[PDB]
Amino acid sequence: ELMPKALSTRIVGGIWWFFTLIIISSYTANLAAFLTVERMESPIDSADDLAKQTKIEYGAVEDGATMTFFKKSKISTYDKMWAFMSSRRQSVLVKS
Amino acid sequence: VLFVIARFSPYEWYNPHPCNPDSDVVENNFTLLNSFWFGVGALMQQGSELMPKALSTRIVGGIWWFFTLIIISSYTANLAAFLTVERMESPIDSADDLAKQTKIEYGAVEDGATMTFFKKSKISTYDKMWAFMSSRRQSVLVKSNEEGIQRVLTSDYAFLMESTTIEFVTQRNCNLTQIGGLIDSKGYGVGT
Amino acid sequence: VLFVIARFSPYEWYNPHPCNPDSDVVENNFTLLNSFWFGVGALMQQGSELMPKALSTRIVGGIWWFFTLIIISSYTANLAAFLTVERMESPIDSADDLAKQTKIEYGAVEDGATMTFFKKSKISTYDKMWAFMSSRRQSVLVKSNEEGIQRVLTSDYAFLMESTTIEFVTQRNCNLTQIGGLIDSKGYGVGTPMGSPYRDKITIAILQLQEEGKLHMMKEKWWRGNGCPEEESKEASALG
Amino acid sequence: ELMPKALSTRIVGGIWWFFTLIIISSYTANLAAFLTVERMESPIDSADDLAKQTKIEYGAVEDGATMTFFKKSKISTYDKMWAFMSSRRQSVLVKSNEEGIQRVLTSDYAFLMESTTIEFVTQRNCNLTQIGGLIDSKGYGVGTPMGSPYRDKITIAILQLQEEGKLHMMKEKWWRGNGCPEEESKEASALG
Amino acid sequence: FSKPFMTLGISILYRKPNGTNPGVFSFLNPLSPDIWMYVLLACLGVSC
Amino acid sequence: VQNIGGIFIVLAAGLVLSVFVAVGEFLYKSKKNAQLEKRSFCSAMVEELRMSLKCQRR
Numbered sequence: 135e136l137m138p139k140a141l142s143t144r145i146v147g148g149i150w151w152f153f154t155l156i157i158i159s160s161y162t163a164n165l166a167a168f169l170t171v172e173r174m175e176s177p178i179d180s181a182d183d184l185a186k187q188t189k190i191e192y193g194a195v196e197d198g199a200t201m202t203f204f205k206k207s208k209i210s211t212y213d214k215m216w217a218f219m220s221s222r223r224q225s226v227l228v229k230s
Numbered sequence: 231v232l233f234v235i236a237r238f239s240p241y242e243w244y245n246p247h248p249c250n251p252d253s254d255v256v257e258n259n260f261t262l263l264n265s266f267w268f269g270v271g272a273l274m275q276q277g278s279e280l281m282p283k284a285l286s287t288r289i290v291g292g293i294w295w296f297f298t299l300i301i302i303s304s305y306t307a308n309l310a311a312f313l314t315v316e317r318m319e320s321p322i323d324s325a326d327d328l329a330k331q332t333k334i335e336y337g338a339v340e341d342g343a344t345m346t347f348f349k350k351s352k353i354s355t356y357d358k359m360w361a362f363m364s365s366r367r368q369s370v371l372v373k374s375n376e377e378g379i380q381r382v383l384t385s386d387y388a389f390l391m392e393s394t395t396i397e398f399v400t401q402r403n404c405n406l407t408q409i410g411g412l413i414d415s416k417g418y419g420v421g422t
Numbered sequence: 423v424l425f426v427i428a429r430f431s432p433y434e435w436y437n438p439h440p441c442n443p444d445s446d447v448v449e450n451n452f453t454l455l456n457s458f459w460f461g462v463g464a465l466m467q468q469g470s471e472l473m474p475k476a477l478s479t480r481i482v483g484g485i486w487w488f489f490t491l492i493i494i495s496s497y498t499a500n501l502a503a504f505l506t507v508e509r510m511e512s513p514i515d516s517a518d519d520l521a522k523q524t525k526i527e528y529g530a531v532e533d534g535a536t537m538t539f540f541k542k543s544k545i546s547t548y549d550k551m552w553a554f555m556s557s558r559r560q561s562v563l564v565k566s567n568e569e570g571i572q573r574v575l576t577s578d579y580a581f582l583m584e585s586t587t588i589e590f591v592t593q594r595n596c597n598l599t600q601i602g603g604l605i606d607s608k609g610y611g612v613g614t615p616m617g618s619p620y621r622d623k624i625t626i627a628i629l630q631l632q633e634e635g636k637l638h639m640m641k642e643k644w645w646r647g648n649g650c651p652e653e654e655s656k657e658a659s660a661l662g
Numbered sequence: 663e664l665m666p667k668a669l670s671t672r673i674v675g676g677i678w679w680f681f682t683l684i685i686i687s688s689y690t691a692n693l694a695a696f697l698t699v700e701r702m703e704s705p706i707d708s709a710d711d712l713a714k715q716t717k718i719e720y721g722a723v724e725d726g727a728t729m730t731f732f733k734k735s736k737i738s739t740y741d742k743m744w745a746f747m748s749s750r751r752q753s754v755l756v757k758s759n760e761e762g763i764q765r766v767l768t769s770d771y772a773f774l775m776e777s778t779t780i781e782f783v784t785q786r787n788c789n790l791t792q793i794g795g796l797i798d799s800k801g802y803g804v805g806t807p808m809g810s811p812y813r814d815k816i817t818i819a820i821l822q823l824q825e826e827g828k829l830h831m832m833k834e835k836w837w838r839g840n841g842c843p844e845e846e847s848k849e850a851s852a853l854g
Numbered sequence: 855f856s857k858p859f860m861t862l863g864i865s866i867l868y869r870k871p872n873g874t875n876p877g878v879f880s881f882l883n884p885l886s887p888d889i890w891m892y893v894l895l896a897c898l899g900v901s902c
Numbered sequence: 903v904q905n906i907g908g909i910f911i912v913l914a915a916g917l918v919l920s921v922f923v924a925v926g927e928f929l930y931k932s933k934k935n936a937q938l939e940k941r942s943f944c945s946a947m948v949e950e951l952r953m954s955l956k957c958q959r960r
C-alpha cells in the first residue's frame with residue numbers, strides 16, 4: 135500500500151528492492167543447477183558406460199563361462215571390461 | 231480463509247470513506263469474491279489493490295506469497311533443466327560412435343556386400359563392427375532390406391544398408407535419417 | 423476483449439467521489455487505450471493500477487495473468503540453456519545454402535580436377551556454381567592447393583580439398599573444420615601413359631599391398647599428425 | 663505509485679518495462695550459467711577422468727615401474743594416457759620422484775606414481791594428496807639375480823622378519839605417521 | 855554336451871538403492887542455512 | 903508452436919468462458935431491474951440502451 139515519499143525513505147526501500155531482486159533471482163538459479171545435474175545424473179544400465187567407470191569394483195568368477203566370454207571377446211565394451219579384470223587380479227575376479 | 235479472518239478480525243470492520251471522518255457504516259473489503267482475485271493475483275504475481283492491513287490478515291497473504299514465490303521459481307528451474315538436457319542430447323554422429331554403443335545393436339542385410347565388407351575391413355572401427363556383427367549374428371543380419379527397414383522402425387537398430395536405398399528411404403519415410411555419410415563408395419554394375 | 427466485457431457488464435461502472443454522497447455521474451476507468459496499457463502492464467509483470475471489478479473481467483485478467491506467467495518464466499528457462507548448452511555452429515551446410523552467399527568464395531585450383539567437375543556439372547546447384555566461379559576467376563579460383571589453404575585462415579574464404587587431404591589439414595591445423603557432405607566420389611588411379619606396358623604390373627602390386635592393407639597401414643600413420651584435442655571444456659560467459 | 667497517463671509517458675515505460683523484462687530474465691539465466699558449470703566440473707578422482715581432460719599436465723617417471731606398466735597396459739584409457747605419454751616426452755615424464763613433486767606443487771602437473779610413497783607424500787607438506795584410487799597391486803620385494811642361491815634364503819629371512827612383525831613395527835618408525843588433519847571435506851554446493 | 859535345458863545370457867548383479875525420499879526442507883538447500891538466517895536477519899533489521 | 907502452443911487454446915478458452923458469465927452478469931441484474939419496476943424484457947433494453955450512450959471516452 136505504502137510507497138515511500140521523501141528521498142531518504144525512497145532510497146532505503148530501493149536498495150532493499152535491489153537486494154530482493156538478487157536473492158529471488160539467485161535462488162532460482164542454483165535450484166536449476168541442482169535440477170539440471172539431477173537430469174545429468176544417469177544411473178548406469180549399459181555395460182558400455184560401465185566399461186569406462188572403474189569406480190565400481192566389478193568383475194566375475196574365475197574360470198567361468200561368463201569369464202571366458204570376456205576372455206575371448208573382441209567387442210569394444212567387453213574388451214575394456216576384460217582389459218582390467220585379468221589385470222587387477224582375483225581381488226575383483228572372484229572364485230565364487 | 232481470508233474472508234473468514236475478515237469476518238473475525240479487530241482491525242477489519244474498519245470504516246469506509248477513508249477521507250471522510252464520518253460515515254462509519256462498516257467496510258468489509260476482503261469478500262469471498264475479493265479473496266479469490268487476491269491470492270490468484272499473487273499466484274500469478276500481479277497482486278490486487280486490496281492489501282492486508284489487519285495484522286491477522288498480514289500473516290496470511292505474506293506467507294501465501296512464500297508459497298507462490300517457491301512454486302513459480304521451482305516451475306522455472308525444472309523447465310530450465312528439462313530444456314537443458316534435451317539440448318545436451320547429442321546423438322551418434324559416426325560409425326565409431328556407434329561401434330561402441332552395444333545397447334544400440336547393428337547388423338545388415340544377411341550375406342550382402344557389407345557382410346563381406348565389414349568382415350574384410352582392415353579399418354579398426356569397421357573391423358570391430360564386424361566383431362559385434364559376429365557376436366549377436368543370429369539376432370542381427372536379417373533376411374532382406376525390408377526386414378531391416380522393419381527393425382529400425384520397431385527397435386534400436388542401425389542396419390548398415392546402402393545409400394541408393396537410403397536416398398529412397400527418406401523419399402517415403404522421413405522418420406529415418408543418414409547418420410554419417412558413405413563408409414565406402416561403390417557402384418551398381420550388371421554382372422556378366 | 424477487455425474493452426468488450428467492460429462495455430457489456432453491468433457489474434461495472436462505479437461512481438467516484440466516495441467521500442461525497444450519491445453524485446449520479448457514471449464512470450469506469452476502462453477505455454481501449456487503458457486496456458492497451460493494462461494488458462501490456464500485465465505482460466511486463468507490472469500491473470497498471472486497475473483492478474477489474476467484474477468476475478467476467480477477472481476472467482479476462484486472470485487467464486491473461488496466467489498466460490503472463492507461463493510465457494515469461496519459459497523465456498528465462500530456455501535462455502539459460504543457450505548460455506549453458508551453447509550449441510555453437512558456424513553452419514552453412516549443403517551445396518544450396520552455401521551458394522546463396524558469396525562470402526564463402528569457392529576455392530578451387532584453376533585447370534583443376536575440381537574445375538572439371540564444376541565445368542560439366544549437371545546438378546542445378548552445381549551447374550550454377552560455374553556461373554560465378556569463372557566470373558571472379560581472379561579471386562574465387564586459387565592457383566594451387568596450398569594457396570587455397572592459406573586463404574581460408576586469413577579470409578572467410580573456403581577451399582575445396584579431397585577427403586583424405588581434408589583429413590590431414592584438419593589434423594595439422596586442429597582449429598580448422600570440414601563443412602558439408604561428400605560431394606565428389608572418385609579414386610587415386612596410379613598414372614601410367616596411354617597404352618602403357620606398366621598397367622597390370624603396378625595394378626597387381628597395389629592389390630598385393632592392399633592384401634595386408636599396406637596402403638592403409640601407411641595411411642593411418644601419415645594421416646596421424648598433431649594431437650587435435652577435438653572438443654574443449656568450456657566455461658560460462660558474462661553477457662556482452 | 664506513479665502512473666503514466668498520456669501516451670508519451672505510456673510508450674516509454676512499457677518499453678522501459680520491456681527493457682526491464684529482459685535484464686532480470688537475462689540475469690537469472692546467466693547466473694544460472696555460472697552455477698551449472700561449477701557443478702558440472704570434476705573432482706577427477708580416477709585415472710580415467712584424469713586421462714581424458716587434457717588439463718592436469720599429467721606425467722610420470724621415465725625409467726620406472728609406472729612407465730613400463732602403461733607402456734604394456736592393455737587397458738584402453740591407460741593406453742589412451744600412454745598415447746599422451748607417447749605424444750609427450752621428458753616434458754611430463756620428468757624422472758625421479760623428487761622431480762615429480764616439484765611440478766605437482768608448483769604447477770597443474772599430475773604425477774603417476776605408487777602407493778606408499780604417495781602415502782608418505784600426504785604425510786608431510788600438507789598441500790598434496792592421493793587423487794583417486796589404487797589401480798593395481800605390485801609389491802616391494804628384494805631384487806635377485808637370476809638363479810642365484812640367495813633368493814630362497816632371504817625369502818625365509820624376510821618372512822620370519824614378518825613373523826616378528828617388524829615390518830609394521832618399523833613402519834611408523836620410518837613413516838612417523840604425521841599431521842595433515844585431512845584438510846578437505848567440503849565444497850559440494852550451497853551458495854553462501 | 856546335449857541340449858540347452860536352461861538357456862540364458864549374462865546380465866549384471868547390482869543394486870545401489872541409497873536414495874529413497876528427501877521429504878525434509880530441500881527447497882531450503884539452494885542457498886545455505888547460514889543465508890536463510892542471515893537474509894531474515896537483514897529484513898528484521900532494516901524494517902526498524 | 904509445438905513447444906508451448908496449447909496455452910493459446912487455454913488463452914482463448916478464457917476468452918470463450920468469459921462470454922458465458924458476462925451475459926450471466928447482464929441478465930441477472932436485469933432480473934433485479936425486472937423485480938423492481940419492469941417485467942422481464944423492458945428491463946433488459948433500457949440499461950443496454952445507455953450502454954450505447956457509453957459516457958464518451960475522450
Ligand SMILES: *[C@@H]1O[C@H](CO)[C@@H](O)[C@H](O)[C@H]1NC(C)=O
Binds near residue numbers: 402403404405
Ligand atoms: C513414419 O513416417 C510415416 C510417414 O512418413 C508416418 O505415417 C509414421 O507415423 C512414422 N512412424 C513413426 C514411428 O513416427
Ligand SMILES: *[C@@H]1O[C@H](CO)[C@@H](O)[C@H](O)[C@H]1NC(C)=O
Binds near residue numbers: 577578
Ligand atoms: C573469423 O575470424 C578470423 C580470424 O580470427 C577471420 O579471418 C574470419 O574472417 C572470421 N570469420 C567471419 C568474420 O565470418
Ligand SMILES: *[C@@H]1O[C@H](CO)[C@@H](O)[C@H](O)[C@H]1NC(C)=O
Binds near residue numbers: 767787788
Ligand atoms: C603448502 O602448505 C603450507 C602450509 O599448509 C602453506 O604455507 C604453503 O603456502 C602451501 N604451498 C602452496 C599453497 O603452494
Ligand SMILES: *[C@@H]1O[C@H](CO)[C@@H](O)[C@H](O)[C@H]1NC(C)=O
Binds near residue numbers: 871872
Ligand atoms: C548405501 O546404504 C548402506 C546402508 O545405509 C550403506 O552402508 C552404504 O554405504 C550406502 N552406499 C553409499 C553411501 O554409497
Ligand SMILES: N[C@@H](CCC(=O)O)C(=O)O
Binds near residue numbers: 197198
Ligand atoms: N554356467 C557357467 C558357470 C556360471 C558362470 O560362470 O557364470 C559354467 O558352466 O562355466
Ligand SMILES: N[C@@H](CCC(=O)O)C(=O)O
Binds near residue numbers: 339342343344392
Ligand atoms: N547391395 C549389396 C547388398 C546390401 C549391402 O550389403 O548393403 C550387395 O550387392 O551385396
Ligand SMILES: N[C@@H](CCC(=O)O)C(=O)O
Binds near residue numbers: 725775
Ligand atoms: N619400485 C619401482 C621403482 C620406483 C618407481 O618406479 O616408482 C620399480 O620396481 O620399478
